[PDB]
């Protein structure tokens, strides 16, 4: 039985509004309703992995797992295996996989982050799951961020706390946060960003939704505008939104948005908004294609509609050669020529690099770079031709060209990372000097750039 080079992944996010679900929720897992929906001809084809994020979930883990498994079995006839389940308060993530994947999945991690302080600590935060699928690392984050139209900055802060403190994936990747630890990272949930239009325009917005005219609403969506201004979710992707706002509905219909201020809302307006979202970030030049992104129309127990997204995702096999794992393959090498980091820092420490990759036996520390002043104020750290030659465990180009090198630039004085990035080895040529580039981030904010040339030697 061949190992796959693609899988499909289902991502669901649903704020259940503290109410039990209806008896049938199959439309969610079938990607049917509004938006980019899945073709009927695929309905019996199971996804490889289903990742379900809930918020305001009133069920026990047992109760929800029974509903989810029975739903998938009804659709597909397949009895899915439970990979992981993790709950923080009423925020939950479930990962289910086809039984044939059970011996492909390993290194399962779970964690949570509680956001806020005192007043604002006790119900918002995130849960996550990571694991290896053969040679490919997968991370999943379900976050319930701060509510309210006038709290976009708090949401952005919540995002930065979650990506700093959620402890998933390979702990040896110590300079790297979750935005660099995974081949594919999916971040979803009740992100709670709102359509920023005046309260007086509520009925106009409702009109627009009834006409399926979302352009003048999406142009005011806080997540899209904050992302455009590089305030949040830097280097993440989101599929175009083609479904109606998923909040805030009257329960038991989808015919009415309930936006007016009430004691139950803290006297806040809830204008129709795309609270419920799926974003992703994959390593450079890895296959990832969104094949659905939409909301259900027929699940009406909550004041939110469920959101689905599905993806094709490239995966790699657990490679064995005569040599690596457990030695190097001297027919393989990675050279960095004429490299330099450009940093936004005002500091004047010396810097060194660390190169981290599962194609290396362990991470590699460089010599200190040479600091120069850039024309427009910046720090330029030059490495010249001084960088250590990297010795991969396997030289086979079918393996090596699919790998990635994580780079951290660290202060000699403090050993703290000032920036992290990633270089693909999916080159146009081997034995050829080729340009490389990554932005550098720290705590998910832009801190600089790394650029230079690479020369990759494979066994071919």
| Residues engaged in binding ligand UWV (CB under 6 A) | 218-219, 221, 224-225, 227-228
CB of 237 to ligand UWV, least distance (A): 9
d(C-alpha 185, C-alpha 139), whole Å = 5
Shorter beta-carbon distance to ligand UWV: residue 171 or 228: 228
Shorter beta-carbon distance to ligand UWV: residue 215 or 267: 215
Phi then psi dihedrals of residue 279, to 5 deg: -125, 160
Is residue 380 reached through a cis peptide bond, with omega within 30 degrees of 0 on the bond before it? no
Shorter beta-carbon distance to ligand UWV: residue 57 or 221: 221
d(C-alpha 13, C-alpha 293), whole Å = 11
CB of 222 to ligand UWV, least distance (A): 9
d(C-alpha 90, C-alpha 125), whole Å = 10
d(C-alpha 141, C-alpha 55), whole Å = 12
d(C-alpha 449, C-alpha 343), whole Å = 7
Shorter beta-carbon distance to ligand UWV: residue 219 or 460: 219
H helices of 37-117, in order, are 61-76
State the residue number with the nearest CB to ligand UWV.
Answer: 227
How far the first Cα of the chain sits from its last, in Å, is 27
Residue linked to tokens 């038991």: 252
Residue 363 CB neighbours (<10 A): 16
CB of 180 to ligand UWV, least distance (A): 19
CB of 229 to ligand UWV, least distance (A): 9
Residue linked to tokens 């175009």: 240
Shorter beta-carbon distance to ligand UWV: residue 82 or 212: 212
Shorter beta-carbon distance to ligand UWV: residue 113 or 185: 185
Question: Closest Cα to residue 318, out of 2, 49, 34, 3?
Answer: 3
CB of 242 to ligand UWV, least distance (A): 13
CB of 280 to ligand UWV, least distance (A): 13
CB of 152 to ligand UWV, least distance (A): 13
Beta strand 49-55 with 6-15 is parallel
CB of 234 to ligand UWV, least distance (A): 9
CA pseudo-torsion sign 76, 80, 83, 84: positive
User: Phi-psi category of 9—alpha, beta or left, where left has phi over 0 and alpha has psi -120 to 50?
Assistant: beta
Shorter beta-carbon distance to ligand UWV: residue 240 or 250: 240
Beta strand 81-88 with 333-343 is unpaired
User: Phi-psi category of 169—alpha, beta or left, where left has phi over 0 and alpha has psi -120 to 50?
Assistant: left
In sequence order, the 6+-apart residues with CB closer than 8 A to the CB of 162 are: 113, 115, 125, 126, 141, 143
Shorter beta-carbon distance to ligand UWV: residue 18 or 219: 219
CB of 279 to ligand UWV, least distance (A): 9
CB of 221 to ligand UWV, least distance (A): 6
CB 165 within 8 A of CB 143: no
Shorter beta-carbon distance to ligand UWV: residue 230 or 262: 230
d(C-alpha 305, C-alpha 433), whole Å = 51
Shorter beta-carbon distance to ligand UWV: residue 187 or 336: 187
């Amino acid at each position: 039985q061949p190992e796959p080079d693609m899988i499909t992944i289902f991502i669901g996010t649903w704020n259940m509004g503290n109410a039990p679900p209806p008896k049938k929720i199959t439309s969610w897992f079938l990607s049917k309703g509004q938006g980019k929906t899945r073709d009927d001809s695929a309905d019996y084809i199971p996804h490889d992995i289903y990742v379900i994020g809930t918020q305001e979930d009133p069920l026990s883990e047992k109760e929800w797992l029974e509903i989810l498994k029975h739903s998938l079995q009804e659709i597909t006839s397949v009895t899915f295996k439970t990979v992981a389940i993790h709950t923080l308060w009423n925020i939950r993530i479930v990962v289910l996989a086809k039984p044939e994947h059970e011996n492909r999945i390993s290194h399962i991690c779970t964690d949570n982050v509680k956001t806020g302080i005192a007043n604002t600590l006790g119900n918002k935060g995130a849960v996550g799951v990571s694991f290896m699928f053969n040679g490919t690392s997968l991370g999943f984050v379900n976050s319930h961020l701060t509510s309210g139209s006038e709290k976009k900055l708090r949401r952005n802060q919540n995002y930065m706390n979650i990506l700093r403190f959620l402890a998933l994936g390979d702990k040896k990747l110590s300079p790297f946060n979750i935005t660099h630890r995974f081949t594919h990272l999916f971040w979803f949930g009740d992100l709670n960003y709102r359509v920023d239009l005046p309260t007086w325009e509520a009925e106009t917005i409702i009109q627009k939704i009834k006409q399926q005219q979302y352009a003048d609403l999406l142009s005011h969506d806080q997540l899209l505008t904050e992302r455009r201004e590089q305030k949040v979710f830097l280097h993440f992707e989101e599929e175009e939104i083609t479904f109606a706002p998923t909040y805030r509905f009257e329960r038991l219909t989808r015919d009415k948005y309930a936006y007016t201020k009430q004691k139950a809302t803290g006297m806040k307006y809830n204008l129709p908004s795309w609270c419920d979202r799926v974003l992703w970030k994959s390593y450079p030049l890895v296959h990832v294609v969104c094949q659905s992104y939409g909301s259900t129309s027929d699940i009406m127990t909550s004041d939110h509609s469920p959101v689905f997204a599905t993806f094709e995702a490239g995966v790699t096999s657990q490679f064995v050669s005569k040599n690596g794992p457990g030695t190097v393959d001297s027919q393989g090498q990675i050279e960095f020529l004429r490299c330099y980091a450009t940093l936004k820092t005002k500091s004047q420490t010396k810097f060194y690099l660390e190169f981290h990759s599962s194609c290396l036996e362990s991470f590699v520390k460089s010599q200190e770079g040479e600091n120069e002043e850039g024309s427009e104020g910046e720090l330029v750290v030059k490495f010249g031709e001084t960088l250590p030659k990297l010795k991969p465990i396997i030289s086979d180009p079918e393996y090596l060209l699919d790998q990635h090198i994580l780079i951290s630039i660290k202060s000699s004085d403090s050993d703290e990372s000032y920036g992290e990035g990633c270089i693909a080895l999916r080159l146009e040529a081997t034995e050829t000097q080729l340009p490389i580039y990554t932005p550098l981030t720290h705590h998910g904010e832009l801190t600089g750039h790394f650029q230079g040339e690479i020369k990759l030697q494979t066994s071919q």
